[PDB]
Design an enzyme around this catalytic site. Structure first.
Site, mmCIF file in Angstrom:
data_model
loop_
_atom_site.group_PDB
_atom_site.id
_atom_site.type_symbol
_atom_site.label_atom_id
_atom_site.label_comp_id
_atom_site.label_asym_id
_atom_site.label_seq_id
_atom_site.Cartn_x
_atom_site.Cartn_y
_atom_site.Cartn_z
ATOM 1 N N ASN A 1 -11.641 4.011 12.201
ATOM 2 C CA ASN A 1 -12.449 3.353 11.156
ATOM 3 C C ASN A 1 -11.630 2.936 9.927
ATOM 4 O O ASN A 1 -12.224 2.620 8.894
ATOM 5 C CB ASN A 1 -13.582 4.264 10.681
ATOM 6 C CG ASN A 1 -14.325 4.983 11.772
ATOM 7 O OD1 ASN A 1 -14.401 6.220 11.785
ATOM 8 N ND2 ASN A 1 -14.876 4.223 12.710
ATOM 9 N N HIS B 1 -9.811 4.806 7.975
ATOM 10 C CA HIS B 1 -9.770 5.844 6.958
ATOM 11 C C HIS B 1 -8.551 6.724 7.211
ATOM 12 O O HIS B 1 -8.132 6.873 8.365
ATOM 13 C CB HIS B 1 -11.034 6.710 7.023
ATOM 14 C CG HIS B 1 -12.273 5.975 6.636
ATOM 15 N ND1 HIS B 1 -12.654 5.856 5.316
ATOM 16 C CD2 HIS B 1 -13.160 5.314 7.410
ATOM 17 C CE1 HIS B 1 -13.752 5.116 5.327
ATOM 18 N NE2 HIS B 1 -14.089 4.760 6.565
ATOM 19 N N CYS C 1 -8.330 9.325 0.008
ATOM 20 C CA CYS C 1 -7.225 8.468 -0.399
ATOM 21 C C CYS C 1 -7.419 7.182 0.423
ATOM 22 O O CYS C 1 -7.601 7.239 1.646
ATOM 23 C CB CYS C 1 -5.874 9.129 -0.122
ATOM 24 S SG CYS C 1 -4.442 8.008 -0.146
#
Ligand SMILES: CN(C)C(=O)Cn1cccn1
Ligand SMILES: CN(C)C(=O)Cn1cccn1
EC number: 3.1.2.14
Lengths: 269, 268
Positions: free
Chosen positions: B190, B192, B227
């Site tokens: 995804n 991330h 982050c």
């Protein structure tokens, strides 16, 4: 995994992991390259060679000699999906006094079709001084009994991409990714940067839009110098081209010392 | 891998790979954490939950709700050697309206002995807005049929390390590793940043001499903020003591906290 019936090649099956896939839910080229090095390492173990990624004999170990990758060439037709089983067959071949070559064939375990292929050139080097030397006859005989004697090429073709000369990228680069540093996960058991990290660093300067709309089909990477644990790398890319082709350069951020050069070919999804 | 006989837990065996080991020829804590997330993902798949690292139901997907790791706690007694087979058993448990907990037990497949254990706390949040919510009752019923109802704790002890409050590191840090950035290999399906990358970043500010003469025994990591792909992180470590360290991950610019944690190391 296991050596095949004639004992001149090695096969292994891998189930693609959740963390090994990208945005397409298929294995990344770095996951593929890690699996090629894993099956290569398991082939060296099954026949008594060193397993530190250098495939040395006790004779080479006494003289502080190691096998090092000079070039890696990977071609992917279909990236395996997460949960899929991929079978990889690998073999090594002598190339006279130049060095050795390791080849791979990737197959879908369910369909049996060739989904990828890879080839790599290895040269003999003194571990300490970094000086190259041609293969001696006494060393040659030790690995020849584990290699097919007739040629067996993963890339047979008359004028194939795996043996093309790669030029040096000229400044200014079209794209760049600056200040790349290896962390401990990027190192191997001997504290050297894993060869797969350099593939990652090359791809970092490819724009996200290319990654989002294209699939990587071919990657040819030349290894000129090793990046140390405390070195910092700059990644440079320039478009050279339906298909997109790029020219790549990895160099140290400071003095601009070349560590790698390569080419990639991408196809629109 | 497969669900166990009662269907309330999942087991899987892994053969340690050549690139997964460190200088001692044994698996790194990042290889361990990757295997815990792999077996967790395979447990979610076997019972019809979401494929991504969010274990959502079709009800959560409609409301754009995801499960997120708030805390990870790992304790290793023996790191598996390269070529060794490790068996991991995992299970999930409801913790009322606070959220869920996922536990793991690592065993040597040859000896059958416990070589490690892990626990993690998960909270429910909106994926777009990032706001927490205390489990909507209808969601509880959906995952409860896959969890043991009586408690089954990987860390039973009454005053154990997995539930300790972690303080914020004060400047100046004793050690630091600055300018850390994620590359594409650090991202998930995804886009991330993988939770295991934050473990790597925390360990980057541990001096090489500690890594060379000690073995990591315990790691407790709190996750405060994600982050992003284009963020830059500073990793900070101070000795608090075996060797014990206090850790802080914050954004290089404004100093916004992303993580805090503690590590415990044993002399080899
Ligand atoms: C690249 N080299 C030197 C090898 O792969 C050696 N080898 C032959 C069979 C197993 N290992
Ligand atoms: C952390 N969560 C939400 C889960 O692990 C849910 N789950 C229970 C069994 C399989 N997945």
């Amino acid at each position: 995994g296991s050596l095949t019936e004639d004992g001149l090649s090695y096969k292994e099956k891998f189930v693609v992991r959740s963390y090994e896939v990208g945005s397409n839910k298929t294995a990344t080229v770095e996951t593929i390259a890690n699996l090629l090095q894993e099956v290569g390492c398991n082939h060296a173990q099954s026949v008594g060679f060193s397993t530190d990624g250098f495939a040395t004999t006790t004779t080479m170990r006494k003289l502080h000699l190691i096998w090092v990758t000079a070039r890696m060439h990977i071609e992917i037709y279909k990236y395996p999906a997460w949960g899929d089983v991929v079978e990889i067959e690998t073999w090594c071949q002598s190339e006279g006094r130049i060095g050795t070559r390791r080849d791979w064939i990737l197959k879908d375990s369910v369909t049996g079709e060739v989904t990828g292929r890879a080839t790599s050139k290895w040269v003999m080097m003194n571990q300490d001084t970094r000086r190259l030397q041609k293969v001696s006859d006494d060393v040659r005989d030790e690995y020849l009994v584990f290699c097919p004697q007739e040629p067996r090429l993963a890339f047979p073709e008359e004028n194939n991409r795996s043996l093309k000369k790669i030029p040096k990228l000229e400044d200014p680069a079209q794209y760049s990714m600056i200040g790349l540093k290896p962390r401990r996960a990027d190192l191997d058991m001997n504290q050297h940067v894993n060869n797969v990290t350099y593939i990652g660093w090359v791809l970092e300067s490819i724009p996200q839009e290319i990654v989002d709309t294209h699939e990587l089909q071919v990657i040819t990477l030349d290894y000129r110098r090793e990046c140390q644990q405390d070195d910092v790398v700059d990644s440079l890319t320039t478009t050279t081209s339906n298909d997109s082709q790029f020219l790549h350069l990895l160099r140290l951020s400071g003095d601009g010392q070349e560590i790698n050069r390569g080419t990639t070919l991408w196809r629109k999804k």
